[PDB]
Amino acid sequence: YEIIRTNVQEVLAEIVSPKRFRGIKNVVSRIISNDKKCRYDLIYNKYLSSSDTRKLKTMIDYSTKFNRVVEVVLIIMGKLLPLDAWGGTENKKVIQDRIVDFLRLGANERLHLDDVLSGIKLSKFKQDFQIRKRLLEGYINWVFISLVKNIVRAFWYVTESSNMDCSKLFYFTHSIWNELSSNWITKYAKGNLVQVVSPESKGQFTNGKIKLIPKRGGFRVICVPLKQSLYSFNNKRNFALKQKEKWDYIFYQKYTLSPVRQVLQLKLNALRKSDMGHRSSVNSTNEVADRILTFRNDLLKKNKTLPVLYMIKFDMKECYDRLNQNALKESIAGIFKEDNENTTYHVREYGTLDEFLKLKRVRTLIETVKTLSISKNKIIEVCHSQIEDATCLVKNKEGQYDLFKRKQGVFQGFSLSGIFCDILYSTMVSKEFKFLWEATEDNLLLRLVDDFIFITSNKDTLKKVKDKISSNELQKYGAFVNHEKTVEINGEAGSSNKMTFVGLDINCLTLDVKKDSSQFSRPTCKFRSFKALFSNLKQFYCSNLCEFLLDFSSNSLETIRENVDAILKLTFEAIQTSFATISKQDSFERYRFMKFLHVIIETTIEKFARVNGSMEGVEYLLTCIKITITKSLAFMATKQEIIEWLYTLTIVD
């Protein structure tokens, strides 16, 4: 069914980017005519379509196994491309291995034609021919992004999991995906949503589109904002309207959302530094470790010895789903209580990813103020609009796309959801745990977004915490404690002494803090050359830099940076480890290494701005990437030129 949607005239234009160049026209013709005479339905019926629809344990089980996916892909590619189109016989296996590695990324990530291009000149058009062989780049680029990618899109819906570790992607067939998703959503809506009768003019802003993510026995619902109105989503052929409403969103994102996001963060940051109750809130994993190791050091100083300690961890059941919208709207007014609303705030104007790629060219990282005004009035209006008016689109199963609203709570995926949850729980914590903010000597409460840990040496103040979490007093805010996941240890030589809180291992007697197995698994750095090492690490970094790690609508920049630093630390430690072994047989070249760094840094920025669509945070993130790489290269004896080059990179103006 036409896996190739362009004619021979179009494919050759793609290859020869601006005749006795006919051998290519010959190959493309056979590939295109093979695509039409290919069945594509006996292949689907043979390997795929799994017509045993018995209720399985986990959603993931419905996915097509990666080995079956590769088998299908390569069997299609084998029919499509004749023996010569593969550049020979050994080149064929080489490219197939590169296709597999491209399938591990889900065929979505950016293709790099330097790793994949490792063939020879035995492709007889399938002194200075070499420099003129940049046609092979266009051919191979056409094979991967136009044939492999379109085969994947044809048969499977590709998504990662929520269960964990986020690199292993799952290929669900379209027929089984639409059936699972439609039935879950229809059930989810009845028990959690309520439809909306009449739309309104500001619909390009509050409309969302549902994206599902497999949770062990179900799904996790994310809401992707629609960059258009409900009208143009049903009128799918009025392309002029969608482009106008798309820029409507871009300007709404640029001048309305981003300012509101910035001011709420300022108020929240001016509470962590000013209010005792807000100092228990913490923005990142490493900040938990640092505050614990500081608390430990305070005890050692203040007491000369560590006393017997009592710690308990608890978390909130579905903090976004059950969030109390009214308790939130009061929290928002609270941090504005002294502002006498006609006061105006001046924040920076940040760019948009769509502004970069639509209006100009690529390679946003070059080797070489603009403030806005927003009023508190408008801020409260936008916050209320996102809380009250946020609607999603659900398939009516006959193609009608009704618009539903949350009965309670906020959608995860809207640009303000994450900071909303931060404002409400910070306000909550500072209000209900009043009795711990003036005795920080021997009690510590720490909050990551919906995870809590309380360490103390006081059996009586431990009861007060256990009495509040066992009470309804927190339900008013929408925080329902996950009582079945609450763990308590004290370490009195009869009690357990270990506890894993946020991916850290904490000892109850020594207050030792560690990292739980470094969940971004071993980078496998046993290679003979530096080029071979950098290619492997480039694959590791891209596949382990998951999108959910860079989402600003759900995590704070501080935690986004620390997830970056985590992948960087593991990437470079594999260089530090194997440098002496490799350097014995292959000479380190700083310029090949700099190109490797340049790819790592560009991928991080490009992926960040693709996930958030808003350049806010790229400059701050870029400078932090410099520092992390500087610190991770300390072992490098001579790195002056590398570092000098590193510090010259900037984002495109």
Write structural notes for this entry.
It is found in: Nucleus; Chromosome, Telomere. It catalyses: DNA(n) + a 2'-deoxyribonucleoside 5'-triphosphate = DNA(n+1) + diphosphate. With 653 residues, the protein is an alpha+beta fold. Helix content is 48%, strand content 13%. It has a domain of 164 residues: Orthogonal Bundle (Topoisomerase I, Chain A, domain 4). Strand 15 and strand 16 form a beta hairpin. Helix 18 packs parallel to helix 20, helix 19 packs parallel to helix 21 and helix 20 packs antiparallel against helix 21. 30% of the residues are buried.
Overall form: globular
How large is the count of helical segments?
Answer: 22
List how many beta strands DSSP finds. 18
Fraction in beta strands:
5-15%
CATH class value of the domain at 8-171: Mainly Alpha
Strand order of the largest sheet: 3-11-10-4-5
What is the makeup of the main sheet?
5 strands, mixed
Class by SSE composition: alpha+beta
CATH topology of the domain at 8-171: Topoisomerase I, Chain A, domain 4
Helix content class:
40-55%
Radius of gyration: 28 Å
CATH architecture label name of the domain at 8-171: Orthogonal Bundle
> How many angstroms separate the termini?
44 Å
